[PDB]
Write a structure and sequence with these properties.
Chain B: It comes from Staphylococcus aureus (strain NCTC 8325 / PS 47). The structure is cut from a larger assembly and holds seven protein chains of seven kinds. By secondary structure, chain B is of the alpha+beta class. Chain B is about 10% helix and about 20% strand. A three-stranded mixed beta sheet of chain B has the order 1-2-3, with helices on one face. The longest helix of chain B is centred in the first third of the chain and has 8 residues. The radius of gyration of chain G is 19 Å and the shape is elongated. Classes of the chains: A alpha/beta, B alpha+beta, C alpha+beta, D alpha+beta, E mainly alpha, F mainly alpha, G alpha+beta. Chains in contact: A-D, A-G, B-E, C-F, C-G, D-G. Bound molecules: magnesium ion and zinc ion. Zinc ion (ZN) binds next to β2 and α2 of chain D. Chain C binds two RNA strands through β1, β2, β5 and α3.
Chain lengths: ~200, ~80, ~130, ~60, ~110, ~140, ~100
RNA sequence: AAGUUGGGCACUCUAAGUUGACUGCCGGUGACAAACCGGAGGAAGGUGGGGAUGACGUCAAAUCAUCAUGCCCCUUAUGAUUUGGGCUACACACGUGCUACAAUGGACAAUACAAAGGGCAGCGAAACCGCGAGGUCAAGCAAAUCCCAUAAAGUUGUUCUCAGUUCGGAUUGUAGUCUGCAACUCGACUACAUGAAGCUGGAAUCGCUAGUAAUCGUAGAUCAGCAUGCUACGGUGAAUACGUUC
RNA sequence: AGAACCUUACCAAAUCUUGACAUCCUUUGACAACUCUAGAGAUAGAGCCUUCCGGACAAAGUGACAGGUGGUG
């Protein structure tokens, strides 16, 4: 019933995460990118990987990993980043160059917030307290608005429901607004709990 | 296949099985799943147990049955 | 020379129209207007701007028109003729505007909507 | 889709006409686009994520 | 009267010749061109030599009762051999692989609710 | 459930006769957008009536519409009678003219229309009968006004 | 004696900036450039059933639009060729050179 | 022969950037307000026309068969391979459409005017062969270049003359083409013949307020082949809205 | 947004049980397109025979384990 805000804004005020062109091997390139992304996600779960951009030119693959914990991904001696490079080169015959981008305020990143609240739910925290503290810190860090939602068998109840909290302005119908959206899933003993977070850090 | 430029279709295994024991007059029944095989004049006087889906219906080949498929004589659906 | 050039549009039809001092003959795509157009009402509509401006038969018209159908091209030619007359004499602006000929008819074919047979027509509904 | 079915689609077919396309992301046999090798559902999901170069919502 | 069948007197020859079983529009035109005769001339305003030539051309086309007998013999042969088409002819159902759940009236007769 | 009355369309005069009524009659006759077919039909009918009457085609047409235009109608509510608007008069006249013309037995639509307009001018047409029935039922229900 | 450069990109912004970059590089190297010429854009529309199951009447329509730019170099020079072949464009745009 | 080439970027067009429309100005109704109506100017006037965008909530509405997933269930089978047959059946009832019942038409010959898409082992030009669907050779084209691809309705001439017909094309016989290892069940199309009902449809019921309805074709996704479905495109182009009683 | 085979989830018949598919563990390769025979095939029997860098990779056996378009929206 609600359009995915990222989907609505892609190509208007939000750039694609896949930056390249093709005419013949579009499908093969696309699915190569998909498997690269799946491998990065499976391997950097602990790292606060906000998102990943992929470009390709001159038979090279440029990966840009925007993360909130760049030290963990790089490694003290570059060992981790070199290992990741090597594994990506093993997966794809082409040559991969990886860059890491630091996110200063992880509490204003929708994906990071969604993953944090989902982890807390898996740890069996309070589905209300988690959202309240999330929104509180996001609002104190200058966010113009934030909305959190958690749906599923909240407290283990047989009947699944959803509850959400909001603060400030989140104008989802404004196409100008650069609204950051993320969805995550907690795999609780009772099943899948879906957490959604919308963040509006203001005009930029 | 159907086009004249291509010869009437028939499974090579079915054709060779029919050709086998051609000289002997004690011709037997030939089990076949090839409902799609065309009926050649070589088949006249033969008995083909053609699979219709669950059982092999016996079919006796005559001259008037030349040019048709073996499946046309082993109906698949049952009604009344 | 003394060419008065102008463009006219209607639906998907564009007519480049050039007016020259002449006897009233209209050529369209190197063909006579009364042969190109399948009805004389279209010719009368083409001449309508000339009647409004009171310069009927004082110009020969050369038309390069493509796009649309015959009605669309005829009205595009009329629009081009009105624009050319404007270019030739600004004093005809009032007469042409009152006649309603300087307006580029903005009506176009509405897209088809998904879930509908046409732009508006919807599938036949049946309760139960 | 069934893993055995995906495997049977990947494997070579003795016929050549016996080849059919499956969505390479989930395995749905129906409604698979050739340009992306994706079913409509995966295409929509990835277009929303912005991970299909140059693909955005259309309107006119 | 050609091939033992009367043809409309006031109808053009090309159209009127279609009333002969086995003669349609294409064969009517072909016959009329083989036996030189005006296309628009009505059969009533026709010459005996033209009629004789038309009969001569028609007699060998294998039309009317012979055509009917040949078609019936084919249908009876496919019924007798016990073919699928023969079974469907016996049961009065579509033979050329139509769907009988709906829209089979021309083979199944009127609706029997 | 309606805010009010919407603006009404205005049609251009007939290119040759310069008559709004003629334009709207052409539109009424037109089916599936075949404006050319409608134009040729109307013009042939006008020529036929001019020939058969020795009188102006526009004159006889205007007399036929005046004859077949009603003044009273009835709307279900029992049917209550009510006066007809001036534009409704022309609409109904043209609609009935075309309908009964199409219902005539002549071979071609041009002949049907010509005969029907002639009968309406003589006051002995199907459209005239329609108008007469409408007036009769309006008078019968005059009380409910 | 002309050289054609065809650029194609999903973003008209990036394609315009790359076209300006290559035109500037050619004019610096010294050659004369006629363009850029915007060829008609090619728009491919994809209509998807929005719902996972049934609900045919609800659809979503995506597009991929590729914009096309043409550049003509008239008076080529070795410097121009070297600069064009050494120039690096954004990963998004695809460049084809016909000498 | 051709915008075919020599030449030009005028025009059109293409596509980036910009200007434009905001009840802005004027006059009436209105409580000097909002607003409504009319007018000037303008290509466009009253959210100019459409699209996307779908709040808080409702129906334990749909989906465990796109995907994921708690719990339960089978594991020598509820898993797996192959050939063949179902999903295409057929005394019947319903929804959605295609084709018609004809003269605002059928047939024949000539001749115009669109838009939007697709093309790599894919679009297959011209030529030759066959009446035909199609076959052989084969140019160009990874695209504003070449092809798909001659739009149809229309216009102009001849014929039919109100007839179940020169309407209509279901039905089936025979003989072909094309794809596919393979058209029996169970593809499409083509030639010849056959030529059913149907002569504007009871109760009832549906869409639509303008480039809309209605008609005419055109293209694409899937796809070896198979569209009356779906999604888009344009050609021609209406009628009516008094009113809120139901 | 494409049921003759495939799709296909259903049925008949002919067949397999670490399995059509994935990871680990032991051995180690020349595995396998290709030609022969029997079969409707899936598959089985002998050859031919071609690859491979401290190891990618690929075959055989065993045990974990796989598998389900099965149910509950
Ligand atoms: Mg809005
Ligand atoms: Zn998918």
């Amino acid at each position: 019933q609600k359009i995915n805000p990222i989907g609505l804004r892609v190509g208007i005020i939000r750039d694609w995460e896949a930056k390249w062109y093709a005419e013949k091997d579009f499908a093969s390139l696309l699915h190569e990118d998909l498997k690269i992304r799946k491998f990065i996600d499976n391997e950097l779960k602990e790292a606060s990987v906000s998102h990943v951009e992929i470009e390709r030119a001159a038979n090279r693959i440029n990966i840009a990993i925007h993360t909130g914990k760049p030290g963990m991904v790089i490694g003290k001696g570059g060992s981790e980043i070199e290992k990741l490079r090597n594994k990506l080169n093993a997966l794809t015959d082409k040559k991969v160059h990886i860059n890491v981008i630091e996110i200063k305020k992880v509490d204003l990143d929708a994906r990071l917030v969604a993953e944090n609240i989902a982890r807390q739910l898996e740890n069996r925290a309070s589905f209300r307290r988690v959202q309240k503290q999330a929104i509180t810190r996001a609002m104190k860090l200058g966010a113009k608005g934030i909305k959190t939602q958690v749906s599923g068998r909240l407290g283990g109840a047989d009947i699944a429901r959803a509850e959400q909290y909001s603060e400030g302005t989140v104008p989802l119908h404004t196409l100008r607004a650069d609204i950051d959206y993320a969805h995550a899933e907690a795999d609780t003993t009772y099943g899948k709990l879906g957490v959604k977070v919308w963040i509006y850090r203001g005009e930029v | 296949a159907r086009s004249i430029k291509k010869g009437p279709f028939v499974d090579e295994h079915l054709m060779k099985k029919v050709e086998a024991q051609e000289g002997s007059e004690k011709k037997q029944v030939i089990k076949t799943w090839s409902r799609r095989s065309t009926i050649f004049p070589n088949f006249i006087g033969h008995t083909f147990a053609v699979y219709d889906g669950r059982k092999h219906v016996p079919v006796y080949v005559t001259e008037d049955m030349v040019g048709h498929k073996l499946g046309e004589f082993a109906p698949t659906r049952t009604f009344k | 020379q003394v060419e008065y050039r102008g463009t006219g549009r209607r639906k998907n039809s564009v007519a480049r129209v050039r007016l020259v001092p002449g006897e009233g003959n209209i050529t369209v795509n190197n063909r006579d207007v009364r042969e190109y157009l399948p009805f004389e009402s279209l010719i009368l509509d083409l001449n309508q701007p000339f009647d409004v401006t009171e310069t009927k038969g004082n110009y020969d018209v050369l038309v390069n028109v493509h796009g649309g159908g015959f009605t669309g091209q005829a009205q595009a030619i009329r629009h081009g003729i009105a624009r050319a007359l404007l270019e030739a004499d600004p004093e005809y602006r009032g007469s042409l505007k009152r006649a309603g000929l300087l307006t580029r008819d903005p009506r176009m074919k509405e897209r088809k909507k998904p879930g509908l047979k046409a732009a508006r027509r919807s599938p036949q509904f049946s309760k139960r | 889709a069934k893993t055995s079915m995906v495997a049977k689609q990947q494997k070579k077919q003795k016929y050549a006409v016996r080849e059919y396309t499956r969505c390479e992301r989930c395995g749905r046999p129906h409604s698979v686009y050739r340009k992306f090798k994706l079913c409509r559902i995966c295409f929509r999901e990835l277009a929303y994520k912005g991970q299909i170069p140059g693909v955005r919502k259309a309107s006119w | 009267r050609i091939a033992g069948v009367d043809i409309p007197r006031e109808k053009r020859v090309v159209i009127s010749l279609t009333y002969i079983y086995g003669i349609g529009t294409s064969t009517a035109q072909k016959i009329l061109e083989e036996a030189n005769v005006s296309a628009d001339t009505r059969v009533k305003d026709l010459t005996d030599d033209e009629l004789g030539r038309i009969r001569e051309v028609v007699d060998g086309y294998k039309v009317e009762g012979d055509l009917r007998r040949e078609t019936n013999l084919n249908i009876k042969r496919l019924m007798e051999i016990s073919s699928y088409r023969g079974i469907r002819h016996r049961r009065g159902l579509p033979v050329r692989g139509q769907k009988t759940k709906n829209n089979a009236r021309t083979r199944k007769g009127p609706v029997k609710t | 459930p309606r805010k009010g009355s919407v603006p009404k369309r205005d049609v251009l005069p007939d290119p040759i006769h310069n008559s709004k009524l003629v334009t709207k009659l052409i539109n009424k006759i037109m089916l599936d957008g075949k404006r050319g077919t409608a134009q040729r039909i109307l013009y042939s009918a006008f020529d036929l009536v001019e020939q058969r009457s020795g009188r102006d085609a526009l004159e006889v047409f205007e007399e036929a519409i005046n004859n077949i235009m009603p003044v009273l109608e009835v709307k279900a509510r029992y049917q209550v009678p009510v006066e007809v608007r001036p534009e409704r008069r022309t609409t109904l006249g043209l609609r009935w003219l075309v309908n009964y013309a199409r219902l005539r037995g002549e071979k071609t639509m041009e002949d049907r229309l010509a005969n029907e307009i002639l009968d309406a001018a003589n006051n002995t047409g199907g459209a005239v009968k329609k108008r007469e029935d409408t007036h009769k039922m309006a008078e019968a229900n005059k009380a409910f006004a | 004696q002309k050289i054609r450069i065809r650029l194609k990109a999903y973003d008209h912004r990036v394609i315009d900036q790359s076209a300006e970059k290559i035109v500037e590089t050619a004019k610096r190297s010294g050659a004369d450039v006629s363009g850029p010429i915007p060829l008609p854009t090619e728009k491919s529309v994809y209509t998807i059933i929005r719902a996972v199951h049934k609900y045919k009447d609800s659809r979503e329509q995506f597009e991929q639009r590729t914009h096309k730019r043409l550049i003509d170099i008239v008076n080529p020079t070795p410097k121009t060729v070297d600069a064009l072949m050494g120039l690096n464009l954004p990963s998004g745009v695809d460049i084809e050179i016909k000498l």
